[PDB]
């Protein structure tokens, strides 16, 4: 009922002194102006039990009035080949062949391969229309000639399709042939499949130059303007080895083509090997090679899934870098989005005296306001404070525009209560094509989202946002710490996980202590290495979260604003295709950190144990808390006092997600266990892994894994590591007007780490 009327995004998450960040805005319609302003974020939790929302206006060269315009967003993934000279519209006979794997065969008109202008009905398209493969040509007069398949496509079955325009016979032809093997299709060789056919129809028009780009997985909407061809009628599923011949092919050739032969190669006008480019570093590029040698190279748009099982995949090798010949398929989705591709409305260059911190561009337009958050770093190669706070921007991308409560059947089961959503969750659902999906949702065709991009308006990034799990979630939740820091006078710097992945341990080493966000769930291998190296040589860390360093993640080297992640298991009932676990951006296996022998315990001291969101618990102290060696941590904290009863996140300092101490998974031997959390309902759940096999009673209050452990361990050169192991830890800082055990405990550690003296040994 309330209407979000404007939204924006920036081109990059972090900017240091001297660098430039660009801002993009789109109003519901083009009229009036909006106001822009720079504000420093401080606290986003309007919960009345806490300190309420806080920000500060900063004078900036960017504030002012700007024309408000609507910016069209290109949605869905596809491949685009430039063809100004109309080379791919041969004046004579021609044929099109490809391999097909349709996931939404009945979801209305979908373009498989086209060089087609839909406004003039000109060119040629291969499309699914009414659940059938149709080959169509047009002359720009509005009349068309079509040949329609005899057998409707079966979902997720591999087909070889051949479309032929034969002007000699004034005839169109279509050759559909099913090429299912033991392992490439939904079902196997048992079922007696009659889905082959050869059909002909009369050709009553010439094919005309459509003046558009050639497309895979879509149709050109209208005559290209300024070079942009808009893609409509998005196809869902895979395409493999699409090629165009400069002659009409016959039954014989379509036969050979369906078995993998490259018939009449000299006559190929263009041939796209989607696997060309696969190396031991994967295929970290959008480039699409024209294997025919003709230079008609394409380009992936909106990150279709690369490194995907092809028509010939037989299952002997599951890593695409070791068998590219069987991974020549691209997986297209109508809801992919790697870049809104808007025109920038203004830009900003960080001036000298601007403190490193959390920032946003505040936008006012009519009776709506939007926040475009970004981050400011210190001048390159320097630090401006002793504390460094890592903004969990890899995790922000993972949950970017999450819509779990709208798409996941068990969404509320996991939450432990009917979720409380807001205006932002209604906007995502009305206009998905403006915002895109997260890695926790599924594509429309029931497959996990494995790419997520910063160059889009990310609504759950706004500080005043509240998330369905019970309160706030990621960036807003991290503002709990940013408020506690600023309230207690701590001078700190800020860097994103993207920056950690860029600079490595050299960044961390400029600080006495590095603080984690509330939920650093997603990390790059380089981030792991940087933390390990920093801590091993005198660094000091504070892991104020849980479920941190759980998923291995990669930053697209060609598109630093895209992140890739492939997961075995998700809340939404999306499939994890069998041979597609390895990342296209580095070729590595990825997945759970524990699975690559880098469990979180190995670096921060504790690792993922369970999750649950009906409410949070408190910490009861353990024997190690009265050890004289840690008396500095337990300052004004009586040994009988509960730690963290009460808070803005579920009402307790230990909940939402809980990490635990485990020697077998890498906890350093010299780790002390100061306290563990209690009061977890059966809503708290354990993820089945090699340590705990599923059985009745694998839930809170019934299994000893379901707790959070407060740990500390020392390292060489006066280093040390402190973990609270609860997402909701930072939610309890402000409790009782900052007079609580969770504040005293965190302060105790922080004051010790910023001291010019070694973290206490052991």
């Amino acid at each position: 009922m309330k209407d979000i009327a404007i939204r924006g995004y920036c081109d990059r998450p972090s900017v240091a002194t001297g660098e430039t960040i660009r801002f993009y805005v789109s109003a519901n319609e083009t009229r009036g102006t909006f106001d822009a302003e720079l504000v420093r974020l401080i606290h986003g939790d309007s919960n009345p039990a806490g300190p309420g929302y806080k920000e500060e206006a900063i004078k900036s060269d960017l504030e002012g009035q700007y024309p408000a315009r609507f910016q069209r967003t290109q949605f869905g993934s596809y491949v685009e080949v430039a063809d100004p000279d109309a080379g791919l519209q041969p004046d004579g006979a021609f044929s099109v062949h490809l391999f097909l794997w349709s996931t939404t065969p009945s979801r209305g008109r979908q373009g498989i391969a086209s060089r087609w202008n839909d406004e003039r009905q000109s060119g040629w398209n291969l499309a699914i229309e009414d659940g059938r493969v149709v080959f169509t040509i047009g002359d720009g007069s509005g009349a068309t000639s079509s040949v329609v398949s005899d057998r409707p496509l079966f979902q997720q079955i591999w087909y070889s399709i051949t479309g032929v325009y034969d002007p000699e016979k004034k005839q169109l032809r279509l050759y559909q042939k099913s090429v299912v093997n033991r392992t490439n299709s939904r079902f196997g060789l048992v079922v007696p499949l009659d889905s082959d056919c050869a059909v002909s129809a009369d050709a009553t028009v010439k094919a005309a130059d459509s003046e558009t780009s050639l497309l895979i997985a879509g149709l050109g909407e209208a005559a290209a303007q300024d070079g942009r061809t808009w893609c409509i009628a998005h196809y869902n599923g895979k395409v493999d080895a699409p090629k165009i011949y400069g002659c009409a092919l016959g039954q014989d050739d379509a036969e050979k083509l369906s078995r993998g032969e490259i018939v009449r190669p000299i006559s190929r006008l263009a041939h796209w090997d989607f696997s060309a480019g696969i190396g031991l570093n994967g295929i970290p590029t959008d480039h699409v090679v024209d294997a025919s040698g003709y230079g008609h190279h394409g380009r992936c748009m909106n990150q279709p899934s690369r490194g995907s099982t092809g028509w010939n995949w037989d299952g002997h090798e599951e890593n695409f870098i070791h068998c590219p010949e069987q991974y020549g398929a691209l997986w297209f989705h109508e809801d992919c989005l790697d870049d809104c591709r808007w025109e920038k409305d203004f830009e900003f260059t960080v001036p000298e005296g601007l403190k490193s911190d959390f920032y946003a561009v505040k936008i006012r337009y009519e009776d709506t306001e939007d926040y475009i958050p970004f981050f400011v770093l210190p001048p390159r190669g320097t630090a401006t404070a002793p504390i460094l706070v890592i903004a969990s921007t890899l995790s922000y991308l993972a949950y970017a525009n999450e819509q779990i409560m709208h798409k996941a059947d068990i969404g509320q089961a996991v939450a432990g209560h009917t979720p409380v959503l807001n205006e932002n969750d209604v906007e995502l659902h009305k206009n998905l094509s403006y915002y895109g999906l997260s890695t926790y949702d599924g594509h429309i065709d029931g497959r996990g989202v494995q790419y997520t991009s910063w160059r889009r308006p990310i609504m759950n990034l706004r500080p005043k946002h509240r998330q369905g799990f019970g309160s706030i979630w990621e960036l807003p939740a991290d503002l709990h710490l940013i408020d506690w820091l600023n309230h207690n006078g701590f001078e700190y710097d800020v860097a994103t996980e993207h920056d950690l992945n860029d600079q490595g341990a050299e960044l961390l080493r400029r600080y006495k202590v590095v603080l984690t966000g509330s939920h650093p769930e997603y990390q790059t291998w380089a981030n792991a290495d940087a933390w390990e190296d920093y801590l091993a040589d005198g660094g000091r860390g504070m892991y104020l979260a849980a479920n941190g360093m759980y998923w291995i993640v990669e930053v697209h080297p060609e598109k630093p604003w895209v992140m890739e992640v492939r997961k075995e298991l998700g809340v939404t009932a999306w499939e994890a295709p069998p041979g597609e676990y390895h990342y296209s951006t580095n070729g590595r296996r990825g997945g759970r950190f524990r699975g690559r022998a880098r469990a979180t315990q190995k670096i921060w001291g504790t690792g993922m144990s369970s999750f649950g969101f009906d409410h949070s618990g408190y910490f009861v102290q353990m024997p190690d808390s009265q050890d004289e060696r840690v008396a500095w941590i337990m300052e004004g904290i009586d040994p009988e006092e509960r730690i963290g009863d009460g808070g803005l996140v579920g009402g307790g300092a230990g909940g939402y997600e809980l990490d635990r101490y485990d020697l077998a998974l890498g906890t350093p031997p010299n780790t002390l266990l100061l306290a563990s959390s209690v009061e977890h309902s059966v809503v708290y759940t354990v993820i089945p892994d090699d340590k705990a096999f599923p059985h009745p009673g694998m839930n809170g209050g019934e299994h000893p894994f379901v707790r959070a452990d407060i740990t500390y361990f020392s390292t060489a050169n006066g280093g040390g590591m402190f973990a609270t192991s609860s997402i909701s830890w930072l939610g309890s800082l402000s409790w009782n007007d900052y007079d609580n055990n969770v504040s005293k405990m965190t302060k105790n550690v922080l004051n010790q780490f910023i001291k010019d003296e070694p973290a206490p040994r052991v």
């Binding site: 057998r151 499949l193 009917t418 979720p419 959503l421 209604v426 009305k430």
Partner: protein, 125 residues
């Protein structure tokens, strides 16, 4: 040979799910009828904060909380901390259906959704 048109074949598991859900809806209405105290238990503390739900209340939660999202209830924050309403998920691209009444707290709206999901099932029997 024999399998030709994909529309001649339906996901026949829907026969089972329709029977499980029917048998399972009756199981829930009977639990409510024989343990009416759980409705009071929920209204007093819908989060289970410091007083975990009873086994029979949890059994009910386990059915409602796992239903398909389409047609499902969530709570919509009209004005946070002052006005909440009951939203019904509709197809992508559509706005939700909003119940008429406004509730002053999250807890109050949670119990309203609980009471309505119960009335909804009584209707289908």
């Amino acid at each position: 040979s024999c399998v030709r048109d994909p529309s001649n074949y339906r996901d026949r598991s829907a026969d089972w799910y329709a029977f499980y859900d029917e048998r399972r809806r009756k199981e829930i209405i009977d639990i409510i009828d024989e343990h009416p105290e759980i409705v009071e238990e929920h209204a007093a503390n819908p989060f289970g904060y410091r007083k975990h739900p009873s086994p029979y209340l949890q059994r009910v939660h386990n059915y409602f909380r796992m239903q398909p999202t389409f047609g499902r209830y969530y709570i919509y924050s009209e004005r946070e901390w002052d006005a909440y309403r009951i939203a019904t998920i509709r197809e992508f691209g559509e706005l939700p259906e909003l119940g008429d009444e406004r509730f002053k707290t999250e807890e109050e709206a949670m119990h309203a959704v609980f009471l309505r999901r119960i009335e909804d099932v009584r209707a289908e029997l």
